[PDB]
Design a protein around this ligand. Structure first.
Ligand SMILES: C[C@@H]1NC[C@@H](O)[C@H](O)[C@@H]1O
Ligand SMILES: C[C@@H]1NC[C@@H](O)[C@H](O)[C@@H]1O
Ligand code: NA
Ligand code: NA
Lengths: 458, 457
């Protein structure tokens, strides 16, 4: 009652695959709310309030390179409506502020610094707008919104992500703006075709919470309706199960590649509050989050907000530095781990599991009824995770994995189990000394294609 | 008019990769080959599909000698006979005596194209004169998506899915409103790198099937053109689709949708022995290649195999001569020595002459007369200039005048063109010159030019 030949062959586009390989990148919420100490601004704030001191975006970018970020998404306009560049379409921008004597352009500062530091740059441009007078008027706000997309996507170099937040607090009897999303997506495709359009867009799906929670099973192949879920019995982005066989079977081919992005902040708020400088996630908590998301088929978008004194604050910088060192050490441990890989079938391809090469993989024969990989360590070694990666250019297929370990006395234990793998599963467990592990890939949609398997000590 | 928008409309990665193929082949083959028809009536007996000695390697060798980059097979034409054993119908090769009923011509072509280094594409006719669900609405969308799913998952990477808008039902036949959006989700999800062509958003049917190339071909056109073959009107046939006058009213409702000129080596698309004396010559095919690949148009050239299983000798000879003339042109081109000088931004003049498609010259924004002079080492007989825009970043040139400085120090106007886009090849009579100057005197914002050359074809 399920079409595996379709589901098992749904694949990322070029832009989705390149985005997936970024793994973790940063959010920067900065703007009028940094000055008023707000999470949501009421709107119509006086631009005179936007006077941050000593802004030094290279300090921001140095910290994000120390945390191993692949890129940065700036809030160019948040829901309050204040624009961080001198848009020709509104006076509610940095050109009406005293910052840099009215001659400032923070989108220009950030995008040029990001480029010098080897970080890709993306833009957040809030659909909801509490200041713009055309908002709630229909086509007039669509024209304004498209004009501001055109400014951001033509004047600031390559854009890797356009992030379209669905949050809207108009509520009961407030303004109604039916956005022309289709029109917006033609603007973004035409002007930055390599960008991913995220959240209220077709390329990247909001994981469904903002607390850093990661699903036990995260399917990148989901009903196509989820691309509309944030745009205006219901299938919602927050649902735990979006892509099981049970959930998707009745949609047939009305399914697509729409992979999750887990967005969360290093502080309780998105914007900077000095009151929260003792509530900054530590390096160890950030690394547990990175292991959970980037080892859970979810890209990680971590926000770190600059203060009204122009900097990323010292606790945040320390946590970023710590996170980048933990991830650098883990990636070197992964790259350098040695073991002999043996397989249940197709032994000629076993070496593709342990070659370091994300474009080679092992695929069991179609009649291998118990696909498995055994990784034998050079001597008894203490491990506490396995890492497995599917060659997702060709689809996402794994549905269950059981991991067993053979201990040095030759007895065996089950170390852990997982459902989905996708871009990467990092299955963690208690520290255990083993001579070998066996990954039993005992549920899959058609034969799985695995580009890496490893046993490691985090 | 909004030049900051229009001058920045760009191809997607798949559209850029497709444009770099330049020319590739169509193979119209199937039931109509056996019935000697251009359009089949439908419900033909599969026993009539009995070609002798089908040898797809003979076809792919001939396409490699013609310099094709890939091949698009008619997997199912309007008559509805399928060249692979689909599970969705019995109107296929499985019900024919070919290959004792155990054949798959889509497999044979796709595997032989891969062995020959040719990309593979699929033509799957939306109009179907046999399939029972045609005209019922969603039941035909289910059949059609089933067949896309077979073709896009069983045969390796697919570079183009070619969705013909031709339909001969007429006023009292069957009515089928295709679910195009559903079809595009199927093709994007199974073959994301494929370009969806004709009745699709990635590649635009040029609007004739005679090999005619527009004087001005804009890849940036009103977005409504993507729906023009899907059912004052704007039509794919209009000579002017993208001038400032035609597009200004549309604002941002424009997109990148580049033209493909499709035509056949014979008067018909399928093989007719009667047309064996009507095969275009190598010289005719190479004039068509210069016109289209020098006219911001991809060229899709059909060569039809016969009921005897092969591309016929005149076709092979024409393809061979075409490939020889193209290779000689590419070598005359890579052989030219010239110094480039520019009107502004001299630091990037060398990007015009480096052979690198990813470097370009762009004049300064206040250069009022952008120009390139190409000086030859000694007087040299030429008869074309080649100029390419860096189309990854958009299409901007609107007019070009080419002058020649002769060895006596006098000068002439050699020719003029409007658009450039991927490549303009501007041809003129043989002339001996010391240098040429490409005066790019109309553009949407500052143009970005990745190649300028003067050559003798
Ligand atoms: C990333 C978060 N998305 C919801 C929005 O309401 C919050 O203010 C942050 O921008
Ligand atoms: C390529 C041509 N497109 C129109 C169709 O009616 C013809 O038979 C050919 O297939
Ligand atoms: Na590998
Ligand atoms: Na160049």
């Amino acid at each position: 009652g399920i079409n595996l030949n379709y589901l098992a062959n749904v694949r990322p586009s070029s832009r989705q695959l390149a985005w997936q390989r970024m793994e973790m990148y940063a959010f920067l919420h900065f703007g009028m709310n940094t000055m008023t100490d707000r999470e949501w601004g009421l709107g119509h704030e006086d631009p005179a309030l936007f006077n941050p001191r000593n802004v030094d975006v290279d300090q921001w970018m140095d910290a994000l390179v120390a945390g191993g970020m692949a890129g940065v998404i700036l809030t160019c306009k948040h829901h309050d409506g204040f624009c961080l560049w001198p848009s020709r379409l509104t006076r509610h921008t940095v050109a009406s502020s005293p910052w840099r004597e009215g001659k400032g352009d923070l989108v220009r500062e950030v995008s040029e610094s990001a480029r010098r530091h080897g970080l890709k740059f993306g833009v957040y441009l809030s659909p909801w707008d509490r200041t713009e007078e055309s908002y709630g008027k229909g086509k007039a706000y669509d024209d304004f919104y498209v004009g501001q997309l055109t400014e951001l996507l033509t004047q600031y170099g390559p854009i890797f992500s356009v992030w379209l937040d669905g949050a809207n607090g108009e509520g009961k009897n407030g303004k109604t703006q039916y956005y022309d999303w289709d029109r917006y997506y033609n603007v973004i495709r035409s002007l930055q075709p390599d960008a991913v359009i995220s959240v209220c867009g077709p390329d990247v799906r909001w994981a469904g919470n903002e607390a850093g929670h990661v699903r036990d099973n995260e399917w990148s192949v989901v009903p196509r309706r989820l691309r509309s879920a944030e745009l205006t019995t219901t299938v919602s982005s927050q649902d735990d199960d979006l892509g099981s066989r049970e959930a998707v079977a009745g949609y047939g081919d009305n399914v697509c590649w729409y992979p999750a992005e887990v967005d969360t902040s290093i502080r309780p708020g998105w914007f900077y509050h000095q009151s929260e400088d003792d509530k900054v996630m530590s390096a160890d908590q950030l690394f547990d989050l990175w292991l959970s998301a980037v080892g859970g088929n979810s890209s990680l978008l971590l926000n770190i907000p600059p203060s009204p004194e122009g900097l990323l604050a010292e606790p945040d910088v320390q946590s970023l530095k710590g996170l980048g060192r933990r991830v650098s050490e883990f990636r070197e441990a992964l790259a350098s781990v040695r073991c002999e890989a043996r397989t249940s079938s197709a032994s000629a391809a076993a070496a593709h599991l342990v070659d370091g090469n994300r474009d080679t993989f092992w695929r069991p024969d179609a009649d291998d009824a118990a696909p498995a990989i055994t990784l034998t360590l050079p001597q008894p070694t203490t491990i506490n995770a396995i890492v497995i990666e599917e060659a997702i250019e060709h689809g996402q297929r794994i549905e269950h994995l059981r991991v067993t370990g053979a201990l040095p006395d030759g007895t065996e234990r089950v170390l852990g189990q997982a459902g989905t793998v996708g871009y990467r599963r990092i299955l963690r467990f208690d520290d255990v000394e083993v001579s070998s592990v066996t990954l039993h890939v005992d549920g899959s949609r058609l034969a799985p294609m695995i580009s890496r398997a490893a046993a490691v000590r985090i």
